[PDB]
Design a protein around this ligand. Structure first.
Ligand code: 6OC
Length: 254
């Protein structure tokens, strides 16, 4: 159909920009995770941690802070590629990014996780879930919620071409707080949803209602972010000497 043909073109466009914006794709993440030249060093305790280089919790926490900032930067680049996005009111572009980056980060982070750990430093390392959970309070509780989501989300078996359209849908949510013009945004998201639906139908013909199942996952993301910000309030009070990146603080004033 000429219609479904316009949707495929959009899917292809989004997939292309996705690959150009995110250096560590799920395809590569899985290749590293499921096993010669791509094998990561494994951090499961203190000595391995110290060897990986070749206050512990705080060192890991800021490292993870730095990457988030980087990720925010990659997501922002990707956003501009979404047709119509740059033509929207500037204030809304900022609002959409403010509320969307973390939901996207956790979505893409699932790509670098399995039930036992996380790929780090661009796949060169793998930090054990057990280790991350042994960290001093309240740091020991920072990643568990993300792993729980990933195990379930990863069960959907989505590939990069699917995720590309899905994160585009996440960014263009007309229900974000403070949006000036909701109409232009919904018209775009509507078009993206149409593209995602077709993509899922064609790429996963035997996966019944994957589309609805993926959309319901948007519920789980919102929870983990809300849960995350609460943990940051604790850190600010117990670690008055620990520094927090400005860009991240500007996004959390919600
Ligand atoms: C961050 C933990 C690890 C980051 C993933 C890989 C590390 C690769 C760098 C080499 C060391 C977990 C989070 O993403 C927490 C939420 C983001 C932080 C925030 O925005 O507050």
């Amino acid at each position: 159909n000429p219609e479904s043909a316009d949707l495929r073109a959009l899917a292809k466009h989004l997939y292309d920009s996705y690959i150009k914006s995110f250096p560590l794709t799920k395809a590569k993440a899985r290749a590293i995770l499921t096993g010669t030249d791509k094998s990561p060093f494994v951090i499961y305790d203190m000595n391995s941690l110290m060897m990986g280089e070749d206050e512990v919790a705080i060192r890991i926490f800021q490292g993870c802070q730095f990457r988030s900032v980087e990720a925010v930067q990659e997501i922002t680049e990707y956003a501009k590629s979404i047709p119509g996005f740059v033509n929207l009111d500037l204030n809304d572009q900022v609002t959409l990014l403010k509320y969307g980056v973390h939901e996207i980060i956790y979505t893409m982070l699932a790509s670098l996780m399995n039930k036992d750990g996380v790929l780090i430093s661009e796949g060169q390392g793998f930090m054990t879930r057990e280790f991350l959970k042994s960290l001093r309070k309240p740091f020991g509780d920072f990643m568990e919620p993300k792993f729980e989501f990933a195990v379930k989300f990863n069960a959907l078996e989505l590939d990069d071409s699917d995720l590309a359209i899905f994160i585009a849908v996440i960014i263009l949510s007309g229900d974000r707080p403070g949006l000036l013009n909701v109409k232009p945004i919904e018209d775009i998201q509507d078009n993206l949803l149409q593209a995602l639906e077709l993509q899922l139908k064609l790429n996963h013909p035997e996966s019944s209602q994957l589309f609805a199942k993926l959309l319901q996952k948007m519920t789980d993301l919102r929870q983990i972010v809300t849960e995350h910000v609460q943990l940051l309030q604790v850190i600010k009070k117990t670690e008055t000497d620990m520094s927090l990146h400005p860009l991240l603080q500007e996004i959390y004033k919600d």
